[PDB]
Design an enzyme around this catalytic site. Structure first.
Site, PDB file in Angstrom:
ATOM      1  N   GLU A 138       4.186 -10.014  -1.030  1.00  0.00           N
ATOM      2  CA  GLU A 138       5.124  -9.589  -0.008  1.00  0.00           C
ATOM      3  C   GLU A 138       5.524 -10.707   0.944  1.00  0.00           C
ATOM      4  OE1 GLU A 138       5.151  -5.597   1.838  1.00  0.00           O
ATOM      5  OE2 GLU A 138       4.001  -6.589   3.411  1.00  0.00           O
ATOM      6  N   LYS A 175       7.011 -11.466   4.630  1.00  0.00           N
ATOM      7  CA  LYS A 175       7.293 -10.949   5.967  1.00  0.00           C
ATOM      8  C   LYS A 175       6.923 -12.017   6.992  1.00  0.00           C
ATOM      9  CE  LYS A 175       3.001  -8.395   6.139  1.00  0.00           C
ATOM     10  NZ  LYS A 175       2.377  -7.060   6.106  1.00  0.00           N
ATOM     11  N   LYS A 184      11.149  -3.229   1.060  1.00  0.00           N
ATOM     12  CA  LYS A 184      10.191  -2.612   1.966  1.00  0.00           C
ATOM     13  C   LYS A 184      10.849  -2.374   3.320  1.00  0.00           C
ATOM     14  CE  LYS A 184       5.485  -2.000   2.249  1.00  0.00           C
ATOM     15  NZ  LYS A 184       4.782  -3.115   2.938  1.00  0.00           N
ATOM     16  N   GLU A 201       4.353   6.037  -0.801  1.00  0.00           N
ATOM     17  CA  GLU A 201       3.167   5.682  -0.046  1.00  0.00           C
ATOM     18  C   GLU A 201       2.468   6.831   0.672  1.00  0.00           C
ATOM     19  OE1 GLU A 201       3.247   1.977   2.372  1.00  0.00           O
ATOM     20  OE2 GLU A 201       2.807   3.302   4.048  1.00  0.00           O
ATOM     21  N   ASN A 203      -1.986   3.278   1.106  1.00  0.00           N
ATOM     22  CA  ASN A 203      -2.041   2.377   2.235  1.00  0.00           C
ATOM     23  C   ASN A 203      -3.329   2.546   3.024  1.00  0.00           C
ATOM     24  OD1 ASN A 203      -1.366   0.492   4.135  1.00  0.00           O
ATOM     25  ND2 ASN A 203       0.599   1.424   4.722  1.00  0.00           N
ATOM     26  N   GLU A 259      -2.561  -0.916  -1.098  1.00  0.00           N
ATOM     27  CA  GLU A 259      -1.819  -1.612  -0.062  1.00  0.00           C
ATOM     28  C   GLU A 259      -2.612  -1.889   1.201  1.00  0.00           C
ATOM     29  OE1 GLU A 259       2.262  -0.026   0.787  1.00  0.00           O
ATOM     30  OE2 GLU A 259       1.576   1.640  -0.443  1.00  0.00           O
ATOM     31  N   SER A 260      -2.360  -3.080   1.761  1.00  0.00           N
ATOM     32  CA  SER A 260      -2.902  -3.548   3.035  1.00  0.00           C
ATOM     33  C   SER A 260      -4.299  -4.091   3.150  1.00  0.00           C
ATOM     34  CB  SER A 260      -2.719  -2.475   4.106  1.00  0.00           C
ATOM     35  OG  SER A 260      -1.367  -2.068   4.143  1.00  0.00           O
TER      36      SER A 260
END
EC number: 4.1.1.48
Length: 247
Positions: A50, A52, A109, A158, A179, A209-210
């Protein structure tokens, strides 16, 4: 959308007022979920890198989006690009540039609450979009899911808790993201994440995720049945880590 408070309520208001983007689509859609499945069969760790620049929890990194994407392309199963402007400092132009530069699947996203945002994702060159169960009502989620599918996209849905999961399963989601981070509080809870991963039908493509920053975490999740991993912060701070995560 649902009743929301805090920064989530704000980002949703911004998305509602988000201007559509008119453009001709060049490349045909490249299925992200199907590419994960083939990486799984070739026994290659599937990482969705990802991009960002900022995040509400503190990330602030300056790194070229094109070079970052071209580097990640050598290893990643696909890319995730933030297009949310206020909190993540993303934009539609960044997505458009990247899509024109790489040939691996791209997930847009953002906080999608209206159909035009899906039109935007398609016109910009994205291959799929993220839909968040906790900001949408069940009827909205169901409409948006069918809408994305009309473009040949299988969205990543999600979830963050059991209620999100009941809804996702009810509407027929085939590609789910678990997530570990609670979007409302920004708190991470890996045990809740592990509990949810264990309740998901074996036929759905699961993406963790995360908060992943180490290869051993990836190894543990993989044994839980996770198909792919969405990693942002650790890779933005150190792109080189992609080599560790992948072996």
């Amino acid at each position: 959308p649902r009743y929301l408070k805090g920064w989530l309520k704000d980002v949703v208001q911004l998305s509602l007022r988000r201007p559509s983007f008119r453009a001709s689509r060049q490349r045909p859609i490249i299925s992200l979920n199907e590419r994960i499945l083939e990486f799984n069969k070739r026994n290659i760790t599937a990482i969705i890198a990802e991009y960002k620049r900022k995040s509400p929890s503190g990330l602030d990194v300056e790194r070229d989006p094109i070079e970052y994407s071209k580097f990640m392309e050598r290893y990643a199963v696909g890319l995730s690009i933030l297009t949310e402007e206020k909190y993540f400092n993303g934009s539609y132009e960044t997505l458009r540039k990247i899509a024109s530069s790489v040939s691996i699947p791209i997930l847009m996203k953002d906080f999608i609450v209206k159909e035009s945002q899906i039109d935007d994702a398609y016109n910009l060159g994205a291959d799929t979009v993220l839909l968040i169960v906790k900001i949408l009502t069940e009827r909205e989620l169901e409409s948006l899911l069918e809408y994305a599918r009309s473009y040949g996209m299988e969205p990543l849905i999600e979830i963050n808790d059991e209620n999100d999961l009941d809804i996702a399963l009810r509407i027929g989601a085939r590609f789910i993201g678990i997530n570990s981070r609670d979007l409302e509080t920004l708190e991470i809870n890996k045990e809740n994440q592990r509990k949810l991963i264990s309740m998901i039908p074996s036929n759905v493509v699961k993406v963790a995720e995360s908060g992943i920053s180490e290869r051993n975490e990836i190894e543990e999740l993989r044994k839980l049945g996770v198909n792919a991993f969405l990693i942002g912060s650790s890779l933005m701070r150190n792109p080189e880590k992609i080599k560790e995560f992948i072996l």
